[PDB]
Every structure is written in structure tokens, then in C-alpha cells.
Design an enzyme around this catalytic site. Structure first.
Site, PDB file in Angstrom:
ATOM      1  N   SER A 144      -6.892  -0.867   1.421  1.00 26.98           N
ATOM      2  CA  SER A 144      -7.556  -1.961   2.098  1.00 26.98           C
ATOM      3  C   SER A 144      -8.270  -1.503   3.360  1.00 26.98           C
ATOM      4  O   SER A 144      -7.854  -0.552   4.033  1.00 26.98           O
ATOM      5  CB  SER A 144      -6.562  -3.076   2.446  1.00 26.98           C
ATOM      6  OG  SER A 144      -5.465  -2.642   3.235  1.00 26.98           O
TER       7      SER A 144
ATOM      8  N   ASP B  32      -7.520  -7.005  11.495  1.00 28.79           N
ATOM      9  CA  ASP B  32      -6.145  -7.424  11.705  1.00 28.79           C
ATOM     10  C   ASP B  32      -6.097  -8.399  12.873  1.00 28.79           C
ATOM     11  O   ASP B  32      -6.517  -8.058  13.986  1.00 28.79           O
ATOM     12  CB  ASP B  32      -5.238  -6.231  12.022  1.00 28.79           C
ATOM     13  CG  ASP B  32      -4.970  -5.318  10.827  1.00 28.79           C
ATOM     14  OD1 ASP B  32      -5.478  -5.582   9.714  1.00 28.79           O
ATOM     15  OD2 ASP B  32      -4.206  -4.337  11.020  1.00 28.79           O
TER      16      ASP B  32
ATOM     17  N   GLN C 187       2.660  -3.272   0.908  1.00 28.95           N
ATOM     18  CA  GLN C 187       2.727  -4.726   1.057  1.00 28.95           C
ATOM     19  C   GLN C 187       2.460  -5.438  -0.259  1.00 28.95           C
ATOM     20  O   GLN C 187       3.011  -6.528  -0.512  1.00 28.95           O
ATOM     21  CB  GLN C 187       1.713  -5.215   2.083  1.00 28.95           C
ATOM     22  CG  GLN C 187       1.577  -4.397   3.348  1.00 28.95           C
ATOM     23  CD  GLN C 187       2.664  -4.702   4.332  1.00 28.95           C
ATOM     24  OE1 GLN C 187       3.792  -5.003   3.948  1.00 28.95           O
ATOM     25  NE2 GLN C 187       2.332  -4.644   5.613  1.00 28.95           N
TER      26      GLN C 187
ATOM     27  N   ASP D   4       1.724   3.573   7.906  1.00 27.85           N
ATOM     28  CA  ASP D   4       0.444   4.211   7.623  1.00 27.85           C
ATOM     29  C   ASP D   4       0.295   5.500   8.415  1.00 27.85           C
ATOM     30  O   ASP D   4      -0.122   6.533   7.874  1.00 27.85           O
ATOM     31  CB  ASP D   4      -0.708   3.239   7.949  1.00 27.85           C
ATOM     32  CG  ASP D   4      -0.760   2.029   7.001  1.00 27.85           C
ATOM     33  OD1 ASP D   4      -0.311   2.148   5.840  1.00 27.85           O
ATOM     34  OD2 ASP D   4      -1.277   0.954   7.402  1.00 27.85           O
TER      35      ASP D   4
HETATM   36  N1  LIG Z   1       0.124  -1.231   7.078  1.00 24.79           N
HETATM   37  C1  LIG Z   1      -0.610  -2.105   8.004  1.00 24.79           C
HETATM   38  C2  LIG Z   1      -1.948  -2.544   7.394  1.00 24.79           C
HETATM   39  O1  LIG Z   1      -1.680  -3.192   6.153  1.00 24.79           O
HETATM   40  C3  LIG Z   1      -2.808  -4.065   5.889  1.00 24.79           C
HETATM   41  N2  LIG Z   1      -2.231  -4.985   4.933  1.00 24.79           N
HETATM   42  C4  LIG Z   1      -1.265  -5.849   5.220  1.00 24.79           C
HETATM   43  N3  LIG Z   1      -0.986  -6.592   4.123  1.00 24.79           N
HETATM   44  C5  LIG Z   1      -1.816  -6.163   3.116  1.00 24.79           C
HETATM   45  C6  LIG Z   1      -1.977  -6.529   1.729  1.00 24.79           C
HETATM   46  N4  LIG Z   1      -1.185  -7.542   1.143  1.00 24.79           N
HETATM   47  N5  LIG Z   1      -2.904  -5.904   0.995  1.00 24.79           N
HETATM   48  C7  LIG Z   1      -3.630  -4.953   1.528  1.00 24.79           C
HETATM   49  N6  LIG Z   1      -3.529  -4.552   2.789  1.00 24.79           N
HETATM   50  C8  LIG Z   1      -2.606  -5.167   3.608  1.00 24.79           C
HETATM   51  C9  LIG Z   1      -3.239  -4.565   7.275  1.00 24.79           C
HETATM   52  O2  LIG Z   1      -4.632  -4.695   7.292  1.00 24.79           O
HETATM   53  C10 LIG Z   1      -2.712  -3.582   8.239  1.00 24.79           C
HETATM   54  O3  LIG Z   1      -3.762  -2.940   8.991  1.00 24.79           O
END
Ligand SMILES: NC[C@H]1O[C@@H](n2cnc3c(N)ncnc32)[C@H](O)[C@@H]1O
Ligand SMILES: NC[C@H]1O[C@@H](n2cnc3c(N)ncnc32)[C@H](O)[C@@H]1O
Lengths: 330, 330
Positions: A15, A19, A179, A264
Site C-alpha cells: 500500500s 495516514d 493488516q 515496516d
Molecule cells: N504498517 C503501517 C502502515 O500500514 C498501512 N496500512 C494499515 N492498514 C492497512 C491495510 N488494511 N491495507 C493496506 N495497508 C494498510 C498504513 O498506511 C500505515 O502507513
């Protein structure tokens, strides 16, 4: 796959988002009544709202770039992406293979963090849904075969298509569904795992994956090369198919500011160390440092790499040998 | 309080907001692992995002107006409120006592609903925090003493200040803390209840209030005139201090579209019936109808009052006597 090799490049799929991060000055757990988990009705009045660059793939690519690695971001964004692109290019991220939607908005993450660092969030995909139209074959054609493709949380269909493309193209991949384990069915989760060079999760997600797939731990370990499970304040476990477990504790934090993107950052640092020839323990030590720097900053990409402060802090947490090795390879 | 009476007016205090409503096409409960409730990490990928007028006080005032009641909305909003004001004035809501912030934005509700109608949301207060600067004494000076002041979810400090003002001014009030029970401490909850003519909650919130106050049910019933607890698909209980419980089942719904504001609609219809001289059972029957109309529409204020369809449906759920009485008073 007889095609030419990219020089040490990691392709990061997942993604790309904006945020919206908020804080709840109480405890989610106190409001979570076990008796009522069958149907919660919960609305948290927040103190704070700040906006930051995000998306798992943006976060991980940023971190690999900051550390000096070669990295290509592969995901779908809206027309606003031009500005985010400049930010990522400022750290050496290759953004040539980001799909820019003609009509849809960049994805939106709306997240509330409580005082115990628990998190509850929505994710509105927008342009992310177009990632299913990205062909990794085209990426490989342009840059060569990556050392590793990270399959991060993404458009659900894209997560599977990307994994299948890595399998048919013979590319090493890391299963990193994080997630989306909440959105993916058991069947959809199971088809992402086989042949993975790495499976990344946090501990909650590991139990969730086991719950929804119906698999035992042995079922999973039979089909991956390494399981990497982060354990909040207890660090990370690195487990091999034959059961050999290497554990690495955290780097002590000075503040607990915002946990978004800590996983991350760990993944980026760990994979950077692995690409650089470091072993499992040294790689997870480096990862733990990037993780703590993200924990101590607001947002996911608002941290800095200062080589001497990094060396000192690594020595302080893991001994001088580890610090010398790690900083040496960077 | 020797001041003059308002003609049958309810003063509605509470939030005024824009609602961002999203749907998760799975089940929150499946992702909620009891083992892990101490520290959730949850992010739901949603299918849908729509924006609607909201806030508990906006919703309840709207509903009272649609039903023909005299109602004054008392809360704080941003400068954008002019448009929302026209919408509410179109249904006869008095908006003269809305505080319009010079600098802050109207509050934002971001809500995700799953397939079982469970809900998880954030609420960003913005201008709502200025409600603590509203003096109900000034409202009463302008319009006369209301029949009832509803103390809905609001700026936490405002919830208490408004309740104290009702107590010192001798105004009947309804304690309706709903969603803020998550944010309010036990002490902050306990100081909202004593002397209430009505305490409204849903069943989850009732258990939460008991949990956080440390009170038993008897502790609560000793200090209020009536407890009204909605029970999802099992309707509503109306309990008097001497234990006498009146139960009213739901109106059968044709669709389960979006539960946001169903409780607000029940409260508005019930209080309208009470103001109109109806008994507890007839009032909760009317309330149950408005509730179901909100459940069958997207948003909180996107429903209509058609007198003959209302009569027919009330007769169908409760018998012809109830329907005749209820529609007669409207
Ligand atoms: N690990 C943290 C990052 O995860 C992204 N994020 C949160 N929920 C998500 C989701 N359900 N699908 C894709 N990206 C996601 C969210 O954009 C954040 O910057
Ligand atoms: N009952 C449904 C209504 O409640 C509003 N709401 C949700 N959470 C809230 C909260 N925590 N404080 C004040 N108002 C809130 C929200 O704006 C929605 O229209």
C-alpha cells in the site's frame, strides 16, 4: 529464470497511503468487555489528529532507501502521488513502477492509538484497488530480477496475483500480509504462504493467521524458509523450518510516541541486513534499531539515520561486536 | 424555578458532526481474539465510504422536528454550520443557540460497520470542545424552561457543566452519555447520573457504565426516575426504581442497512411520545419505529415520516390499538 539480475534490488509491493493518526487518551482494553466482543459498539473521542505519508510499501521502501539500499516501490496511487514521489526519490527510492490512477484517490488510513499502543484503524483503498493491474513481469523487464519481492498488505487480489507472478517467475518473495489478515479469508491467506523465503507477522497476526487458515505452526513451517514474528516489547523470534529459534530483544526506547510503521521499519532494516550478507541475529538487531527510531517519532517516515548515534545505540543494546559489524556493512 | 415555561420544548445538548461511514465486509468478532484483547492491532479494509450529517444532538433534534415536536439544538459547531443549519431548520429545529466557532472545524466521526452491525469509530472533536462555553441559563432566558434537557455525548467537560446547570436550575434532564462512556472516567460518569429523569444506554453501554463506575444496578436505580436500555434485536427495557420492567420488542426491519443513529432515533421518538402524554410502552413503540426507519436508511437523518405507512407498520408490529393511539397524538 534466465533473465538478468538487478544489482541487490528489493521490490516492495503493498500500500501507498496518507495516514491520519489520532490518539485516544485511554485504554481500548478497558472498554473491550469480553462478554460483548460478539458485537462491539465503540467510538473513541481523540485528542489529536496528524497526517503523514504512509502505506506499508511506502514505509518499507523509504526505510530501505534511507539505509542506502536499492529499492523499487510497486503499488498504485492517485494523481496526488507526484508530491509523495519527490519525497521518496529524495531517499533514493525508484518510483518508476508506481501505477498512477486516472480517477481514484490515494488510499486513506485513519488510525487511533491508545495509551498502551494498541491500534484500531480503517483503510479506504481508493487507487490501491488498481494494484491488481500491475504486472511484476514488466517491473522485472525494466530493472532485472530483484533479489526479493516483498508482498505487503495491498489490494487483496493484487496480493495473490503478485505472489503467483513471483512463483511463476522464480522470484524469492516475502509474505508480509500484516493488516490485511483481517480482511482476507482463510483460503486467501493460505494461498499467499507456500514457498515464501520469509513470513513476517507480529504475534497477534501470527495467532490470527493460524486461527483463520486452520493451520498448525508445523503446517506453516513446512512451506516457508523462515518465520519472523515480532513480539512487541519482547523483540522478535526468527524460526527455521527445523525449529531452530533465534531471539532478539528490542532496542530500549526513550519514548513510546507512535507505533505506526514500527513493523515496516523492522522489516526494512532486517531485509537490508540480509541483503548485505548479515546473519539472522545481526539483521534483526539492525531492524530493531530502525523500529525503535520509528517508535520514537510521529508518523512512519519522520526519522533520520545518523551513523554515529546508530553505532552507539547498537553497541549499547547488543554489544560492540554487533554494532561494528552492522555499521560496517552500511 | 419560577421562570416561564417553553411550550413543550426539548433542549437537545450533544455533538454536532459530519459522519464518515464505512463498511467492513467481514466480522469484527472473528478478528477479535480474546487472548489478545489487552493490546489489539486492527486495521479494517473497507468497501465503501459515505458522508452524512450527524452528531447525537443533530440526529435527535432532527428526529424530534420531523415528528412535529418543538426542539432546540444546543451544541458547538464550526463556521460550516450554516449549511447544516438550513437542513435542520427545514424540519423545524431551533438552532439559535448553536455556538459557532471562530477558528475550529465541525467535529468528525469516522466509523466502520461490519456485517453483524458492530461498530468501531473515532471522533475528532474540533469545535465540539467549545460546548463547555455554552450556558444553558442563556438558552432558558431566551426560550423559557424546557420540559426536558437531553445531555448527550459531548465535550466531556460540557456534559458535566450542562448537567450541573440543569440541577441548579431545576430542569428535568436525561442522562444520555452513550459513546463517551469510553472516554469518561468512572468519576466523570458517576457525576452525570444523579437526579436524571431518564438514563439512556444500549446494553453494552449499560455494562460498561456499571463496570467503570463500580456501581451495582441498585446503586443506579436509587438515583434516577427511569432506566431505558436498548437491547439490539431484543428491543428495549424500561425499568422503574421499584423494579417494574416494561419490555418492548423491535419493529421488524426489511433491511439492516446502517445502525448509526438508531439509538438517537429511538430516544427522539420515545421522548416525543412522552412529551405527548403517551405511556412508557406506547412511547417505546413509537421510538422503535423511528429506530427501524434509521436502520433501513444510510446515515442518521436520511429517513422520512409518512403518516399512513407509519400507522400501518405500527399496527403490524404492536396491534391496532397502539397504532391508533400513537398516530393520533401526532
Ligand atoms: N504498517 C503501517 C502502515 O500500514 C498501512 N496500512 C494499515 N492498514 C492497512 C491495510 N488494511 N491495507 C493496506 N495497508 C494498510 C498504513 O498506511 C500505515 O502507513
Ligand atoms: N449516535 C450516532 C452519532 O453519534 C455521534 N458520535 C459518535 N461518537 C461520538 C462521541 N465519542 N462523542 C460525541 N458524539 C459521537 C456521531 O456523530 C453519530 O452521528
Amino acid at each position: 529464470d534466465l533473465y538478468f539480475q538487478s544489482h541487490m534490488t528489493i521490490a516492495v509491493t503493498g500500500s501507498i497511503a496518507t495516514d491520519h493518526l489520532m490518539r485516544f487518551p485511554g485504554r481500548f482494553s478497558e472498554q473491550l468487555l469480553p462478554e460483548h466482543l460478539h458485537k462491539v459498539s465503540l467510538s473513541f473521542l481523540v485528542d489529536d489528529l496528524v497526517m503523514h505519508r504512509g502505506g506499508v510499501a511506502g514505509n518499507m521502501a523509504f526505510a530501505i532507501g534511507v539505509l542506502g539500499g536499492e529499492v523499487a516501490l510497486v503499488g498504485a496511487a492517485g494523481a496526488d502521488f507526484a508530491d509523495y514521489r519527490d519525497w521518496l526519490k529524495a531517499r533514493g527510492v525508484n518510483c518508476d513502477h508506481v501505477l498512477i490512477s486516472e480517477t481514484a484517490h490515494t488510499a486513506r488510513f485513519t488510525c487511533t492509538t491508545d495509551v498502551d499502543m494498541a491500534q484500531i484503524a480503517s483503510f479506504y483503498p481508493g487507487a490501491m484497488s488498481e494494484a491488481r493491474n500491475i504486472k511484476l513481469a514488466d517491473v522485472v523487464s525494466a530493472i532485472g530480477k530483484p533479489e526479493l519481492v516483498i508482498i505487503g498488505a495491498n489490494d487483496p487480489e493484487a496480493m495473490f496475483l503478485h505472489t503467483e507472478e513471483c512463483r511463476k517467475l522464480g522470484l524469492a518473495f516475502a509474505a508480509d500480509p500484516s493488516q490485511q489478515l483481517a480482511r482476507l479469508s482463510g483460503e486467501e491467506i493460505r494461498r499467499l504462504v507456500n514457498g515464501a523465503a520469509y513470513l513476517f507477522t507480529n504475534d497477534y497476526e501470527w495467532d490470527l493467521l493460524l486461527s483463520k487458515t486452520g493451520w498448525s505452526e508445523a503446517d506453516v513451517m513446512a512451506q516457508i524458509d523462515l518465520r519472523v514474528t515480532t513480539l512487541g516489547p519482547k523483540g522478535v523470534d526468527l524460526v527455521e523450518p527445523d525449529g531452530t529459534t533465534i531471539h532478539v530483544g528490542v532496542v530500549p526506547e526513550t519514548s513510546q510516541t507512535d507505533p505506526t510503521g514500527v513493523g515496516d521499519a523492522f522489516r526494512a532494516g532486517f531485509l537490508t541486513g540480509r541483503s548485505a550478507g548479515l546473519g539472522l541475529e545481526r539483521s534483526a538487531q539492525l531492524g530493531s534499531l530502525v523500529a525503535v527510531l520509528v517508535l520514537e517519532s510521529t508518523g512512519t517516515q519522520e526519522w533520520q539515520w545518523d551513523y554515529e548515534a546508530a553505532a552507539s545505540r547498537l553497541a549499547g543494546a547488543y554489544g560492540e561486536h554487533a554494532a561494528a559489524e552492522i555499521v560496517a556493512v552500511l
